[PDB]
Amino acid sequence: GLLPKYNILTEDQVQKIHENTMKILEEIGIEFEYEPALEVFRREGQKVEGKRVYLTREFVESKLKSAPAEFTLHARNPENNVVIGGDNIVFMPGYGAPFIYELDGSRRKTTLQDYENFAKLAGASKNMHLSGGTMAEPQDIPDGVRHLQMLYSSIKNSDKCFMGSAEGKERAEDSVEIAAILFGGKDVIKEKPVLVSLINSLTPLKYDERMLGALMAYAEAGQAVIIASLVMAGSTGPASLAGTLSLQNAEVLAGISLAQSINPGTPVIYGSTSALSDMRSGSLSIGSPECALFISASAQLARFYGVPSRSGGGLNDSKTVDAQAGYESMMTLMAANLTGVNFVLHTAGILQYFMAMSYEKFIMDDEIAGMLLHYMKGYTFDEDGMAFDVIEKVGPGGHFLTQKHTRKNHKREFYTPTLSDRSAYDTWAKEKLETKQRAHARWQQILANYVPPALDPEIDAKLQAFIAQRGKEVG
Amino acid sequence: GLLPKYNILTEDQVQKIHENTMKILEEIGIEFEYEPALEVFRREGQKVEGKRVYLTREFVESKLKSAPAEFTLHARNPENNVVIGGDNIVFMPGYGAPFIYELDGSRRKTTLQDYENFAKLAGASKNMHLSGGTMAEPQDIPDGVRHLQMLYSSIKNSDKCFMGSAEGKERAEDSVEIAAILFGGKDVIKEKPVLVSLINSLTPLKYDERMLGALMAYAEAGQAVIIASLVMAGSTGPASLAGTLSLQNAEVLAGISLAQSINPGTPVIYGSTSALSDMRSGSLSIGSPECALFISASAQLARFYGVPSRSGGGLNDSKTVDAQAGYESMMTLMAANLTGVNFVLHTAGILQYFMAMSYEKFIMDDEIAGMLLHYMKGYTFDEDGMAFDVIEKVGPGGHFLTQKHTRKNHKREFYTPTLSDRSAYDTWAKEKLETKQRAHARWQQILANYVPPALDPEIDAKLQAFIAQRGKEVGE
């Protein structure tokens, strides 16, 4: 009923990586740019020189041992509750992009209306399990209330799970307060998690105050944190795959141990965003087989450490929804699915190494998403199934076009494409639409038809009341 | 170095397929429309009613044991010798397409010049290990001598391995003669196989005269055959994954068991071309995840039966080199690579479920092939390596780009793209070239600057005298 996961590493090699990781954390250490964070380490008997911290293997292997292998995140509509990790996998849009690249190859700043559109699309879509977070940076809006309008867009436009803000102590806490209003208290959400948020390290071997202030805010509440590291081999990490993975490993676990020492059993996702620093281009390259290699190894490491994994997505370096957007996104999304990544931020919409979102790419990515979930269902070994009797009725030289079996079973075992054009030349040649152009017609169809799920009047009567008060307070 | 193969099925599931396949062969049978193949199965003690042969698992499982797990195909230039069957993988162009799809959307008939062009492109590419066969149908040339002209154009334009004709006994025997001239004798090429050729069943549960005629000629000589079944689920096969796989499995093992009855130990490749008959279009769909599942499972069945596999390629249903060409072809080729297919016909050039080759698509596919081979290299766990001391040197907040170890190892471990554009928007926005356009400039550059490897004048002269005489025979 479900394909097994691909593990690309031998068990001796996983041992090498971990032995190298432990050595890094012990010998070289990690700088945490936050007093409260250092205090936690000191109060946990770890070595700490100014901002630097050296964790032993026992302290980390101990802190990991309390980190839960699986946790539900809770949706407003419980029909969309989501189990993290899992032979399970969840998909959701790209995150952080300040640009929209349009079908015409032009570029523009993102807006709240983009955030909102992407919320609706993720809402509308059978394959997007979460509506996501920071889908399109709302430069439309004044900075200190961007989070406020964003979590409200996510609530008013989706009944699926959304993400909390990682931009600071107070922002983090606002988000927790907002989930609280939405589920009826902070205690409810402490035991039934609601938010996930992306906490990043500052490669190589640091953590900035803003991320940390969000991380601890979340681990002191009940809420989920992705501890992602983005090591760019050649640049912010060593020019070797084993090297940059070892470095990524050291960073992610240091973040996990902090959360776990702050709050034992608090939900944490191992995050890998590592890729290549292209030496010809100077810059990040996530459409690379190196990226695909980090995605793949990271999924296996996360199993090894007993925790859920986030990595991959429709990842690529193209500026347009062309053949490159297609083959690079598939390579990285397929890696993520086959190797059993649990949580795929950036499943849909991303172009040019996280620099841009695209409406057409969103639809492209949703197709490949559906195709890969279909691959991962596998084969069905029941009577219908093995189909012996139909093969027999038909016999040598017959066809199956008109069998009852074909009519009943095609629908059951086969994927209906949402985007791919499967017609003959003469049919296609009348308009010669490429995937880009079809994708464009499709997103417009979907936003024209999406009715957002209703939000209890009094709930958003309290959502607004709070956005009002904080609106003043931050000014 | 290299990465382990992905096995998508459990031991039990593999056994269930095998059971369903034996039942199909024992109870339903396959038609072999070629008296000589029928007489082979007769002497083997197998039931024949008219043209229908029923094969027992005792017989099939016995014959499979004589098929080698690995063999070598031998090229003009022995550096291009190729192992079929290890953890090994070999790539080559598309096969059989009668159209070229152009950058501007138009289509036209394939000619001999197209054939030659693809032989050169294959010849020039570091990721194509064979030049292929039937790369473009030479509709240009009288039907009866086409195979003669393709074989020569293969031998002249590339010193890599190439494929024989599968179009009947006589054209197979011509292929064997040509191979024997090139390498010294029929004896030498029986000990050191040279040719590989595509023998398809006629799904469901048939094999026609022309394919059987070629199969038996090649088995009799030492030459490799791909025994390949293309089942279309919902059309020529049942509308189910396990069912279509079982039917394909029955077709292939019936074919391999015939080859091994003729010449025990003769080189065979288990071939899966199975895909979807799409419900809305009524046509073959190879860019489907069903196709990807057939490829993956077949890679693992071949391992089970102890023979090499062929399946997959840059397979897609698109009419143009667009995002669908990209994602469909990467899915099916990545499946092939990760599950450990040995021989990938149609790695490069195919559009629209085998109806077309495209020169831009060839370049695209050559890029995805390169990326995929880099993926399967995997990690390097030596000292340089785990990079601990360079990490120690640099330290928190540092950067690696100005280190000796970066200079040393950047090129060693990282893939350099031949097609993907990794620039920032502002560079790219100057011309806004999409992949298909960059591909278009590249194939023209490659072809323009390609120089075929010198062919021995004496052997060349013999090849031409053989082909001159045969063409006269075929015209009389």
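qc> Chain A has one domain: 10-475.
qc> done
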